[PDB]
Design a protein around this ligand. Structure first.
Ligand SMILES: *[C@@H]1O[C@H](CO)[C@@H](O[C@@H]2O[C@H](CO)[C@@H](O[C@@H]3O[C@H](CO)[C@@H](O[C@H]4O[C@H](CO)[C@@H](O)[C@H](O)[C@@H]4O)[C@H](O)[C@@H]3O)[C@H](O)[C@H]2NC(C)=O)[C@H](O)[C@H]1NC(C)=O
Ligand SMILES: *[C@@H]1O[C@H](CO)[C@@H](O[C@@H]2O[C@H](CO)[C@@H](O[C@@H]3O[C@H](CO)[C@@H](O[C@H]4O[C@H](CO)[C@@H](O)[C@H](O)[C@@H]4O)[C@H](O)[C@@H]3O)[C@H](O)[C@H]2NC(C)=O)[C@H](O)[C@H]1NC(C)=O
Ligand SMILES: *[C@@H]1O[C@H](CO)[C@@H](O[C@@H]2O[C@H](CO)[C@@H](O[C@@H]3O[C@H](CO)[C@@H](O[C@H]4O[C@H](CO)[C@@H](O)[C@H](O)[C@@H]4O)[C@H](O)[C@@H]3O)[C@H](O)[C@H]2NC(C)=O)[C@H](O)[C@H]1NC(C)=O
Ligand SMILES: *[C@@H]1O[C@H](CO)[C@@H](O[C@@H]2O[C@H](CO)[C@@H](O[C@@H]3O[C@H](CO)[C@@H](O[C@H]4O[C@H](CO)[C@@H](O)[C@H](O)[C@@H]4O)[C@H](O)[C@@H]3O)[C@H](O)[C@H]2NC(C)=O)[C@H](O)[C@H]1NC(C)=O
Ligand SMILES: *[C@@H]1O[C@H](CO)[C@@H](O[C@@H]2O[C@H](CO)[C@@H](O[C@@H]3O[C@H](CO)[C@@H](O[C@H]4O[C@H](CO)[C@@H](O)[C@H](O)[C@@H]4O)[C@H](O)[C@@H]3O)[C@H](O)[C@H]2NC(C)=O)[C@H](O)[C@H]1NC(C)=O
Ligand SMILES: *[C@@H]1O[C@H](CO)[C@@H](O)[C@H](O)[C@H]1NC(C)=O
Ligand SMILES: *[C@@H]1O[C@H](CO)[C@@H](O)[C@H](O)[C@H]1NC(C)=O
Ligand SMILES: *[C@@H]1O[C@H](CO)[C@@H](O)[C@H](O)[C@H]1NC(C)=O
Ligand SMILES: *[C@@H]1O[C@H](CO)[C@@H](O)[C@H](O)[C@H]1NC(C)=O
Ligand SMILES: *[C@@H]1O[C@H](CO)[C@@H](O)[C@H](O)[C@H]1NC(C)=O
Lengths: 316, 316, 316, 316, 316
């Protein structure tokens, strides 16, 4: 039998081993944009056929995890894993199940940290297509062929997963063929699109900015004769805009090097406030008309620009 | 005897193994709302019957932990564990106790990090029903049946536990039947309701906000003739409200994406201050009556709104 | 001999093993009030008698640490340890010493993190009685009896330890009997009282608050005729008190949920400043006497209140 | 055969083992300037010839990773590694491939943290030449000779790598000879120049500073007759410059002890603002001409100084 | 031969083993004053004579690291290590070299974290004499005698090490005799004096404070007639001094409980500014002479006090 053949894959020499995969994401622990990765716990299930491990019977038997050290198991590995570990809570979280016809069920609880590149250009409404790829580290396509057990039904838990900030709406599984120097491999890629919620940032960041712009508009009505009111409203507007900029800049650490969307909108609001103050100063200098015309020109142009920005960042 | 049968569960083929469970939470190390989990140390005790491990005698014997590697132990596992480890202080923290009739006592010190979903909508008075679920990773309900030794007496230490911010008032144990693709499992769920203290946030955050609103009310009495006093009181009110908002927003990191309760109350206070300032400005503009009427209208309506908010967030 | 009896404790069946303990705290690495624990390195020494490990001779012999895997060692464990590890610098930091009459010396370097509950009510002058408890995880009092080798002598290094913020003044060792569900255990508890230094917080936090209150007192002498000086002194007082409050609140993270002592004193100072400003405003309103009477009333009452607070928080 | 000769290197005594190396940087996880290191995942491939491991055949065979414990593998090590670990996702990420003529392919997934010294003098445009050096820890040049399989081809993935803040433009591999006390070693050094992006810091930090200097220039046009406008513009300029300095100083922790470039430019801008304010004060004192001459002198000299600084920090 | 004698030290019974030590600090990774320790990577080399490991020959042979598990190696350990680990990059970073006459070379790459007590009284110019002590954990002076191979030449890399903030100027090695309860041990202590750079803190913290004091001096020239200029200069001075105090207090976390030197100097500057403001207020009150006399008295006394402070904190 397979005494010292545990190093030899089933059908050592000839047809490769067809391993069917099943994934069950118990929970996506975190999604770090600063480190550009995601930590998630998965229930990796693999099913192959070992002709040397067959027996006479009708039913299957669940064996201890310590038997894994005596049998052959596929060298499955996450392609873009930075740090992963099999859970050892009480014993090794390994399920091994031997079947009559040779089927071997191998289940593991793996907490993995996969790095998916994130483009934060449309940061408030960005959709990140993050992938979890499983491949054989040592055995190429001529030795191990990885396959999905039930297509897109193989992966479970992603449909009902609701993260803190993101939400999976479209996930699917593919059987790609990776071409490396050592050889050709069959890679199983489960890719899912994480879309951040849109309402939170609007009601918590965009609404205060709109209120600041409204206060800047109101600042036009107050004239220079009432210097206390003008000074107070200007101080409040400037201080609130500075605090809003600070709060927006402190949400995400200085790690990204792209042009964001919330930053552009806040810069537009700050530029509008600065231009309003500069126009008030210029009107005062010229007087010692324009303000009345601005009181009607600013709302229409500002609303049109806001609609243009929204149409640009939602549709095209 | 069970020479190589340590991989075989007791009564391998036929009736399952009835394992009685006992829990003893020594300490809940932390409760992280940002990561939405809790780290706690538990004294997991399991009792089953091994017919192959029986002997002739009357008394029980405590064996070394290293004997665990030679016997069969259940593959108990925490369902929602992110990171757990058996303590190795001097030796492996394992108690194995063999009995005359076949009873096996298996005790472990496990520091586990279980993720329980937290809803922070009523954040100052939120009650989180966090669960600790134990299940067999490999053996289904037809092989291992998990049971509580003494019902709700089995779990000890939760009644006398007093955390820093929370307090357990109602905890109970259930025997649920989890239906997975591999098979049906008997899960033991100890769920406990953690209720945060109510007085600390009221006396440290709500009271300063009430004092700020009182100062805003007092600002009405001071007229425009004394510009220094009005300027000082307005500056103090605005600066204090901004600092209070900053302190409230820095307590919890930017991880939750829900509408909180302390945020709503602080926003109401900020809106009241802003409306008071705007009404003062409008009254000054109209004069160059309303303030006297407001001095009587504001207290009653404000108190009624506060009572309505309290009744909404305490009862229904 | 004890071929496979390494799993069997000495005198397996009958009188228990009397293990004498010796502790040597090399350094208390940290004392975290936010996590409510302390990390310290200890030189754990255990001495028992193994009748099966006796030989003919007169002298003792130091054996390699790898021999520990072949002998029986007590399952000593820290009762409230959150994370501990035996040091592996070059080899395993284990001293095993075999003696002629059967004495076995077992020394380990253990960096442990013990959680001791901290009451921060009198935070500037709090004394925390933190304990380090050693117990047998598996063997009860009928199998292993833990004893202190030399009573309060046994523990060394605590008398000469001077931490950054604390100072041990009274430490002692007790032999308690813990009653658990599994059985009764002999626990060795070394408890030490850590007292924080009193002068640092007085000279760095209380003195600036006293200077702020003195400046608030001086603010009474300046009249309303010199509006620049009054405005400057008021701005300086308010800004300094806000900065002092911020610095006091940022020293300890938002983890405790108790009423502190430094917070109470700073709140008293802030209330005094606010009351001084309010009284100045009320006197100005009434004039358009009281201030002169206050200039004499405030010092005596303030000093008496400070003495009462000091007597309350030092003696009773 | 090589029964106990796994401790003996191939050709034990005589000609050394020629090991050909291949590197494949899957991802550079992080580049920490505060800790002055970089964490990256590499696919280390080694090819040597074991005369004792030859067999009769024509094709190669991929063996299990557990066979590595039975064969001889080179003691390759990263020279400046602070913390590294071979990935264990499902099994040990080891590829072992035995060939007919004796070639042995050994592939490992290693996440390493190499410390490369960073000179942050020209911090916005600094180019760091960070190295990854592989050497034999035990076997000197007379026992193991490390060689690159394909010269600069050998390393793959660096050309297409685009980090968050840096960009590799020139990387190359060298075979150096390290002279140590124990012996002479053949070190394989892959050194790559990481150049930080230039546009982000200009458009996000330098542009606000330029706008602040422009506002300071505009402050000259406003005269002392309009004290509200002058006070507002001065307050805005000072507050904005302080906030910009704070934001620049909070980007990098207080770890470097060098004279940076962004700090010098921001200090120049702050000195310009302070000198403008001082000159305005001096002109007011002298009046109770210079400002008109300054309105023309400042732009030319400021632009020339900026061009000189740019030429200094880009070319020489 | 030494079949089971690997637990027995060479010359088991009689003369002790003379182990010659060699140190090579590859890099001091960090020096944490908050935790009062330093993390550094060392190349620990030990040379002893094993009479049972001799063979017939003329040359030495480098054996695999896995042979270490079969031989006897000294139980060297860092006396004040909080956390250390032998590097496992590809294999165990162990060099074992057997010689003809019995010499055994044992080299290890150890990243260690040694706690050296730090006195931050003269914090800007503090010199910390931090030690790295190596001792035998189990074998006393009658079993293992640790010796330096070449005295001060034994340690390499410290002379050319230039850290971020510190600089080693005087390091030396000593053979001390530690007296413990178990026995007397030969400890090898390499102690080095780390001196922080003096110019960085002067040009980045002391220079802004001096500029603030200069601005406070200039504030005397401006009279009360120009209230805008006086208000602006006072606001700038107070705000800049507060920001400088905040920046100085945020450099080091609230962990030390000593009287620093930079804190004393900044407090002196703050007291000077406060006294200048108080003297201006008192002069204004008395007028409604002193300022002219102060304009000459302040520079000389301030310079003399600064020189006295410098002489105190540099020489005696
Ligand atoms: C023992 O037998 C071995 C196999 O039976 C022999 O190894 C092979 O040796 C040949 C040549 O000696 C190698 O061919 C080269 O392989 C290179 C790497 O694949 C090729 O480079 C091309 O491909 C890589 C990968 O995509 C590109 O990155 C690169 O830019 C280029 O396009 C060469 O072009 C060439 O084909 C062959 O790869 C080796 N096989 C393996 C598995 O390494 C070995 O030489 C024999 N030894 C003796 C002494 O006879
Ligand atoms: C060797 O013997 C094995 C067992 O004796 C055989 O394995 C079984 O094979 C059958 C069909 O070949 C499997 O039946 C299917 O199982 C699917 C998964 O359970 C079912 O899917 C349904 O259930 C899942 C889980 O709830 C849902 O997620 C899914 O949406 C769907 O509702 C199918 O509907 C179908 O029943 C059976 O499960 C296999 N058993 C195991 C333990 O995997 C094996 O085929 C035999 N091999 C040979 C060569 O004869
Ligand atoms: C095989 O032999 C075993 C021992 O020889 C048997 O185990 C014992 O079984 C008896 C009853 O079947 C147990 O008695 C109960 O134990 C409970 C737990 O101790 C008690 O509860 C009380 O004490 C706990 C602990 O303090 C409290 O928390 C609780 O609130 C309550 O006050 C019960 O009151 C009762 O005494 C005994 O404990 C078992 N021993 C052990 C070591 O578990 C076993 O049943 C035998 N099996 C067969 C098939 O005969
Ligand atoms: C058993 O055999 C061993 C080897 O066969 C012997 O070890 C050698 O012993 C000799 C002298 O006893 C050593 O020579 C010295 O080595 C020093 C270290 O290399 C040299 O120092 C110089 O080089 C170092 C390293 O560059 C510099 O840092 C230093 O400043 C100086 O420039 C000495 O100058 C001198 O050569 C030799 O190194 C040993 N070999 C090894 C591998 O250690 C051993 O003595 C024999 N024992 C007996 C009992 O006979
Ligand atoms: C078996 O043989 C063993 C050794 O052959 C015996 O162990 C020794 O037992 C004697 C007394 O029974 C111990 O003497 C005491 O040791 C104390 C600890 O050293 C001393 O305390 C003094 O020294 C310590 C350490 O510096 C100080 O901290 C303390 O304050 C005090 O000054 C005592 O004063 C006294 O000497 C001896 O130490 C033991 N040896 C060891 C290695 O532990 C053992 O008893 C024998 N058993 C039987 C049954 O005969
Ligand atoms: C899964 O669904 C995707 C669409 O989201 C589709 O492209 C793919 O073919 C599906 N895979 C299978 C085979 O079910
Ligand atoms: C434990 O308590 C819960 C809640 O009261 C109850 O539903 C359950 O039946 C109890 N279990 C036992 C066995 O007492
Ligand atoms: C240790 O000290 C405590 C406190 O003084 C005392 O109660 C106890 O009895 C002492 N133990 C011995 C054995 O000296
Ligand atoms: C690798 O590239 C460097 C830089 O061009 C060159 O100096 C070196 O010789 C190259 N090595 C080989 C073997 O091509
Ligand atoms: C090492 O140098 C120190 C002085 O730096 C000296 O005290 C010591 O004796 C020297 N050791 C030897 C043996 O060279």
């Amino acid at each position: 039998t397979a005494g010292y053949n545990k190093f030899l894959r089933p059908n050592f020499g000839g047809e490769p081993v067809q391993i069917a995969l099943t994934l069950d994401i118990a929970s996506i622990s975190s999604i770090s944009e600063s480190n550009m990765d995601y930590t998630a716990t998965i229930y990796l299930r693999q099913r192959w056929m070992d002709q040397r491990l067959v027996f006479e019977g009708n039913k299957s038997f669940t064996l201890d995890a310590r038997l894994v050290e005596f049998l052959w198991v596929p060298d499955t590995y996450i392609v873009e894993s930075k740090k992963s570990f099999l859970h050892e809570v009480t014993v090794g979280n390994r399920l091994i199940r031997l079947f009559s016809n040779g089927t071997v069920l191998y289940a593991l609880r793996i907490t993995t940290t996969v790095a998916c590149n994130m483009d934060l250009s449309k940061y408030p409404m960005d959709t990140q297509t993050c992938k979890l790829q499983l491949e054989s580290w040592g055995y190429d396509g001529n030795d191990v062929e990885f396959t999905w057990l039930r297509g897109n039904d193989s992966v479970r838990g992603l449909e009902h997963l609701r993260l803190a900030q993101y939400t999976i709406e479209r996930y699917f599984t593919l059987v790609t063929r990776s071409q490396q120097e050592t050889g050709n491999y069959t890679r199983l890629v489960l890719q899912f699109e994480l879309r951040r919620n849109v309402l939170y940032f609007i009601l918590e960041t965009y609404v205060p900015s709109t209120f600041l712009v409204v206060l800047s508009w109101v600042s036009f009505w107050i004239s220079l004769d009432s210097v206390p009111a003008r000074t107070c409203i200007g101080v409040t507007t400037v201080l609130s805009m500075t605090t809003l900029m600070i709060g927006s800049r402190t949400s995400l650490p200085n790690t990204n090097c792209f042009i964001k969307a919330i930053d552009v909108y806040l810069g537009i609001c700050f530029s509008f406030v600065f231009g309003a103050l500069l126009e008030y100063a210029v009107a005062h200098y010229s007087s010692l008309n324009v303000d009345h015309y601005s009181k009607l020109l600013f709302p229409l142009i500002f609303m049109l620009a806001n609609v243009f920005y929204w149409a640009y960042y939602m549709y095209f």
